[PDB]
Amino acid sequence: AAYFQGAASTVKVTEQLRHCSEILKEMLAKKHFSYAWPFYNPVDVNALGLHNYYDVVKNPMDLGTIKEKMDNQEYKDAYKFAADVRLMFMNCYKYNPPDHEVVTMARMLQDVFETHFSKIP
Numbered sequence: 496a497a498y499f500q501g502a503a504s505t506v507k508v509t510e511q512l513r514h515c516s517e518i519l520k521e522m523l524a525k526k527h528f529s530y531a532w533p534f535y536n537p538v539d540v541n542a543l544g545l546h547n548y549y550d551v552v553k554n555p556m557d558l559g560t561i562k563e564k565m566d567n568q569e570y571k572d573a574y575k576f577a578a579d580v581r582l583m584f585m586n587c588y589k590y591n592p593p594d595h596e597v598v599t600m601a602r603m604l605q606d607v608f609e610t611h612f613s614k615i616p
């Protein structure tokens with residue numbers, strides 16, 4: 496009984512993290528490029544002229560960083576992964592006026608993410 500329950504837990508967490516990897520690859524996949532490209536790389540605040548970005552956004556996040564964190568064994572559960580993805584979107588909505596096209600793009604990518612995440616075991 497104890498070994499079986501222990502194995503069930505290991506299997507579940509592993510399946511959940513494999514789903515996370517599939518979702519990250521889906522968001523980085525090329526079918527979503529039209530609205531995902533602003534989230535591929537960290538914001539270069541100097542090139543973009545955004546001297547206040549780090550004052551507003553205390554914990555910047557982007558898909559490239561999440562990928563390096565996942566490749567470096569840093570997510571021990573799917574819920575920490577999901578929190579980093581949602582942070583990326585939350586930062587976009589906090590910094591930008593809702594009428595900016597980048598916010599529309601975030602909403603489209605977030606819908607993709609949430610639809611796939613809602614299917615996590």
Ligand SMILES: CC[C@@H]1C(=O)N(C)c2cnc(Nc3ccc(C(=O)N[C@H]4CC[C@@H](N5CCN(CC6CC6)CC5)CC4)cc3OC)nc2N1C(C)C
Pocket residue numbers: 533534538542543544545548586587590591595597
């Ligand atoms: C970080 C905040 C938000 C966000 O949440 N994410 C995730 C995000 C991600 N990626 C981007 N990309 C770019 C955004 C913009 C450009 C551009 O050419 N910007 C030009 C506008 C200003 C210009 N200078 C010179 C001329 N000056 C004109 C004089 C009259 C004042 C005005 C100031 C030159 C550069 C290029 C991008 O990438 C190639 N933007 C993002 N935003 C945007 C709202 C900034």
